[PDB]
């Protein structure tokens, strides 16, 4: 199921990173 199972993993990996650096931005100004 490399066509699909890999399809979902990327579909929920690239997006989830955007919620990684977003956490810093919310973390950055909080400390400031």
């Amino acid at each position: 199921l490399r066509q699909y199972y890999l399809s979902k993993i990327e579909e929920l990996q690239l997006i989830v990173n955007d919620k990684s650096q977003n956490l810093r931005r919310l973390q950055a100004q909080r400390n400031e």
Partner: protein
Amino acid sequence: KTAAAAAEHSQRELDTVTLEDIKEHVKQLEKAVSGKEPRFVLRALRMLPSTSRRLNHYVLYKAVQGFFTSNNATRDFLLPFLEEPMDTEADLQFRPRTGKAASTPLLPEVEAYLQLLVVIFMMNSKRYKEAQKISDDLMQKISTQNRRALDLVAAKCYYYHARVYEFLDKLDVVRSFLHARLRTATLRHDADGQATLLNLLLRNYLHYSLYDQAEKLVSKSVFPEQANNNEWARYLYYTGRIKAIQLEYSEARRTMTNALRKAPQHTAVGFKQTVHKLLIVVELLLGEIPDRLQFRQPSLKRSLMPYFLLTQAVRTGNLAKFNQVLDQFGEKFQADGTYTLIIRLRHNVIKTGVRMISLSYSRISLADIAQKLQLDSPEDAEFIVAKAIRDGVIEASINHEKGYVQSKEMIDIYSTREPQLAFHQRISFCLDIHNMSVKAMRFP
């Protein structure tokens, strides 16, 4: 000959610089893969034209042998297809990859980068057969994997492949791959691949004048707003041309001016010329005098001089001058791509005059207007003014009882309830810019 030695030294310097730069982009690709940050790949694409031509075929072969030290199936299949170079004793040992680096297979990103570099090289070489074959191999290599990072360079790869195929006039052949790859990108939501693919899909119809098909593909398709400035400019140009040929003019002119403003200020001399030319024809057709500032620009002077003549003739409203200008410049007009709209102008000339009269006066006797617009009949004048009101060019109600042509009234909505609506768009745009700015702060 000292000139030959100097040229060889220059080529060697260029090749060394190019190898260093290629290593730099490879490092950028590795960083982008490690950190899910395609900013470096966007930089590589941006600087891609700069590195179009600085090597030779033997330099490329040696570089590929040194780089793809990994037992890569792509290199293994491509090497036999490549023409075997004649036996040369000079073979420098280029092994930047040792131990872990050599053992690690070369990334498809780097492979595609080098392949497209060869594409550019033998492109300037005009090596169409091998270009096509290499593009097909690249297509299979991309299709084997489903990594988003690849599409970043794969988009320009498709672009160069399409550009090669255009020389061969094989657009009817490309269309299949173009449509399929657009469908795949859409199913994956690859912004840049989608942008370029939609652009070229449109370009096909534009050159082939399948305007109904183009309208379908533009209306039904969806263009993500995060696209690059260049692709946005292309999209706006093509959409403006399609609308203008489609007899819709206001939206076409608005879009064309927006694209022209978005277009690069100093680069793309010919393309800027074309966009200006289409916008000029559209404006003249919509009964508005263009900006005389452009027609004196040194960058866009002679490609328009016929159009300066055309606009002067239309403004003067001299039928003999219009006919003579057409008789003298029809061939150039065809070449540009504006003959249809100019044929429309050839009878729509009087609209600009009616607009100017209805804008300069406030109440004109119908006989006076007939004398003004050389119709030779009050009835003809009445019909024309009704036409002007209907098309939405003038806003005056014609009273066929006292020859009145009553224009608009006193202070309009633009000082009562218009300014608020005007400011709302500005405020929305400014807040949008701020929100994008804050949300694009930083990764670390």
